[model samples]
Target: GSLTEDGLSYKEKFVVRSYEVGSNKTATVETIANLLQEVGCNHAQSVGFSATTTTMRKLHLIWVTARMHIEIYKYPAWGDVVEIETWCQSEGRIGTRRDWILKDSVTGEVTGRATSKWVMMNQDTRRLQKVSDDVRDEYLVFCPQEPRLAFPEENNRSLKKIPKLEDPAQYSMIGLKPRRADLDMNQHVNNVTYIGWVLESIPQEIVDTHELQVITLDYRRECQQDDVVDSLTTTTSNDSQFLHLLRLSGDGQEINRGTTLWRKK
Candidate 1:
């Protein structure tokens, strides 16, 4: 059975391409993010929605990511085939949860897992709104009878809520602006770019010897076309753990908060 017959969950295959990989010839976290996002869109489209917000568009609304967590046990190298399975379930009254499982298609070994929460926003006013019964009933069939999680309910360090970083971080990268290409269909800086910005202030030595093993992101506000950004980073108690923050240069309003765990390569 294909996407349509998969009952709420969707499964898709991806081939690691040359451009998607880094110098090590393995898919980068950003590349994996692109794959996950594409499959999510494809799943939404398969159900007659141009995208996740297509159905909501009729009501002048769109979906926005509120938070996300991703953990990679191993990276897929170029030319490797990977399968990703994604499904959704209700999350409180105004939110919906989506989860994914990434596996090596040929070996059946899991490569990564991710989960995210999203909420609907009024596209015109850019305000959050409650999901009506009509919207809930339409997508209810996609939710599993029993909600599942990519990570356990507790005990996963990567899923923990990232503590807020205080002022006076160790390193700061200032005067960053969104490139024209960074905007997504939603007209704001895309989620992937925010993740990139989170790492912009990391020390180079860490970048050379360590690889990202887990990342947890909490998106606070949207960044507009003309908005400027600043990235901040500080080492945590654990040598390989770090706290990251991205903010507006004007008011220092928070845009995103992140915590990353790295392992030596």
Candidate 2:
């Protein structure tokens, strides 16, 4: 629970302090995840470790599917406070889903919000499982109780080959090799680095051609150190700019999927 002062609600409107132009600021993905962990840590008394892990693991699951999407307004400045709020909606057997909304406290404006999907698993058996009833029931008390945004629609394209970086539009798949720097203490690629790799895949020409304004990413699976992951991206012609789609791909394996609406100037 974010403590309030003088009837001001940080939960409703948040903030992301900005860093100096060339400062080694944390990646938006890192910033979001860290804040998420903060939300989890703060709510632990209510949600508990088991439920928090269950929720955090959802971020990993989407990495598998490559459906993890992150949209940030701008980076935070040094010494600025970032406000965070989280809630979940019932999504049946796959598991309940949660999201975080971050903002600049001073402006009462939304800096960013990340939405994710998760499924419970039996670690020993490696099988799918439903969230524990106790876990689910406890969360319902403050769960969003109302939905903010709809889940992204799925694409049915096959990722048979890694899309060529040159003629990106001609292919459905893209590949990214995990680097040592991508990992965190947990031994998993720090979640936001994956977003950077995906964003990097967008041709500079395309990014330059259009304003490259809006980007939305969704995570479906995780790629650890030394793991090679692939992406499947597509585009749909919207009235103004094209809509870009992305997903995870590997040796005949597929995971998450997402779409981006890009408007060209």
Candidate 3:
């Protein structure tokens, strides 16, 4: 299959391993993120984009984690092989966006959808950098100039931003420390770990009865190795939706603000 046959989308198939699933025997959200990154890396490498002397990283540019929203329509069981198709588009002058469609290959159904954003950072100075023309040109040919989204904001349903759960949030899980193992290839705390932190304060009763169907994370800042973290949550209408906030305990810096919609089992 041509990578650019249709619209410069990169497609790959991944099988869920037993270790990648949870007690219910379905792929866990963290596993889904892991798969995304694996396929994402593969796509970058296919286009000579890497941390080598002759690659995009050759320009002293590094990928920075920014934002992600994943909506799971159905979870695949272990042994299920699924296909994920992802595409990238320019986001403003400095950022780029990636979107994915997870498919049930056997049934040809879409099992999940995800959209995310990334920016390039000056690896030496630790500052965000505009994707210069030379670096952007290498990959722009594969990307469709028109915008596309996995989670398009349809008129009937809205993907509203989750409001900040200010101080005095009903539920709080404090004093969570970042483990060294949590750091990703970028040496910063991975975004998947932030998902775990966001759900830390959710009570077990909800955990037993309901499961997450939709998640939207707006990452405001990166979590460091020594930063003490806090997770706060508050229930929204119908008890089906919840707002979440993660912050640094030192100066109360916002790490992420998110919302999760759940479904009864």
Question: How does residue 16 of candidate 3 score in lDDT?
Answer: 94
What's the TM for model 2?
0.61
- lDDT of model 2, residue 156: 19
> What are the Cα lDDT values of the candidates?
0.84, 0.50, 0.80
Candidate with best TM-score? 1
TM-score each candidate.
Answer: 0.92, 0.61, 0.88
Ranked candidates (TM-score, high to low): 1, 3, 2
Q: Write the per-residue lDDT of candidate 2 for residues 115-168, one digit (tens) a residue.
A: 665566553344556656655664565455555452343541111122222325
Clashes of each: 0, 36, 0
Q: Of the pair 1 and 2, which is ahead by lDDT?
A: 1
Tell me each candidate's RMSD, in Å, in order: 2.0, 7.1, 2.7
Error of 2 at 109 (Å): 2.2
Top-down lDDT ranking = 1, 3, 2
Report the lDDT tens digits of candidate 1 across residue range 153-234. Answer: 6687645777788989998899888897898875778789888788889888887788889889998898888999999999
Give the least accurate 10-residue stretch of model 3, judged by summed lDDT.
48-57
Question: Model 2: residues >4 Å from true position, as ranges?
Answer: 1-42, 45-47, 50-81, 92-94, 132-135, 141-175, 208-221, 238-250, 263-265
